[PDB]
Amino acid sequence: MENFQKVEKIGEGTYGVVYKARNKLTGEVVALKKIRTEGVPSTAIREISLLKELNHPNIVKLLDVIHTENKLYLVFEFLHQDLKKFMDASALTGIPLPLIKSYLFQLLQGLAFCHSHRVLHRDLKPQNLLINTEGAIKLADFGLARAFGVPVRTYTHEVVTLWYRAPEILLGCKYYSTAVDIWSLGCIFAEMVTRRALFPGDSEIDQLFRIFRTLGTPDEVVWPGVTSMPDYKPSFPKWARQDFSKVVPPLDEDGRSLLSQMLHYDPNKRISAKAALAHPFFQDVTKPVPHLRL
Numbered sequence: 367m368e369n370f371q372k373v374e375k376i377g378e379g380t381y382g383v384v385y386k387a388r389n390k391l392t393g394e395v396v397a398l399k400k401i402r403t404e405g406v407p408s409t410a411i412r413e414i415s416l417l418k419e420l421n422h423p424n425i426v427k428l429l430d431v432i433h434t435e436n437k438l439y440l441v442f443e444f445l446h447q448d449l450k451k452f453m454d455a456s457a458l459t460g461i462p463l464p465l466i467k468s469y470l471f472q473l474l475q476g477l478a479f480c481h482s483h484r485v486l487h488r489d490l491k492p493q494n495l496l497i498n499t500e501g502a503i504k505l506a507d508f509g510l511a512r513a514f515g516v517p518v519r520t521y522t523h524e525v526v527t528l529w530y531r532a533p534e535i536l537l538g539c540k541y542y543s544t545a546v547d548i549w550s551l552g553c554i555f556a557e558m559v560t561r562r563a564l565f566p567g568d569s570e571i572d573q574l575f576r577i578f579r580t581l582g583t584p585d586e587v588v589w590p591g592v593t594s595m596p597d598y599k600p601s602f603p604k605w606a607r608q609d610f611s612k613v614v615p616p617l618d619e620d621g622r623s624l625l626s627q628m629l630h631y632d633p634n635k636r637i638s639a640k641a642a643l644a645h646p647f648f649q650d651v652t653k654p655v656p657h658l659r660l
């Protein structure tokens with residue numbers, strides 16, 4: 367391109383086409399995301415530009431925001447693999463617990479950092495978690511959602527996964543809190559453990575009902591105010607809560623305990639990233655080297 371050279375198409379993300387590219391001048395290899403539609407609000411430019419300062423070892427660095435030719439390009443540090451591909455590659459044997467624990471610990475540090483800076487992700491999923499050969503894992507796309515209101519779809523009729531969406535979002539709550547990210551990470555934690563998505567909904571109501579069938583239909587006792595949420599319906603079926611030991615076997619009680627706190631219905635009772643880091647589950651955390659085949 368003007369200063370780059372497409373090495374290939376890394377994919378077709380939630381916002382647009384993503385290319386692995388090499389800077390012709392510096393020689394650095396980066397991920398280039400071309401954002402979708404015919405104006406690009408200046409509000410989004412200032413918002414995104416702010417994220418260039420959000421630097422942490424567990425957050426994918428946003429190197430540049432280029433608004434030229436009236437188009438929007440986001441330049442990110444490049445990592446060779448995402449957690450979704452890695453979990454598929456580890457499907458037969460499963461990701462070893464020490465590595466699951468290291469990944470969860472690093473992700474929580476990343477969230478604690480973003481959340482302490484009043485930045486929410488809002489759309490965490492295995493595909494947005496990038497890993498390298500040194501055992502590091504990083505959150506990609508933090509803050510883009512807010513700087514772009516609602517996602518809906520990618521840019522080429524692609525189906526948005528609802529699997530990691532917190533219940534308050536599904537019940538129509540208009541204001542997101544840091545708690546939505548904890549929920550998504552809890553779903554991801556469970557998926558790494560069992561090797562199966564925790565709530566693989568295929569519609570918004572199927573998503574909600576899958577959650578209800580496992581954690582029990584929420585009520586005013588466990589979630590004060592839930593019955594007044596925008597999309598709550600008194601006609602929701604009432605399902606009994608399932609024993610946690612049946613949800614993520616064979617995770618130990620430290621892990622089940624942390625997961626249950628990351629999955630509390632009430633966003634206000636849900637554990638913060640900071641508090642989660644102090645959970646006994648991380649008492650023996652280490653940083654193993656993964657087996658990446660690139």
Ligand SMILES: COc1cc(NCc2cccnc2)c(C(N)=O)cc1[N+](=O)[O-]
Pocket residue numbers: 376377378379384386396397398399426442443444445446447448496506
């Ligand atoms: C398409 O998604 C992405 C994937 C990425 N890497 C993981 C990867 C996956 C497949 C092949 N090669 C690398 C990166 C990045 N920052 O390195 C960015 C985006 N993105 O959305 O900006």
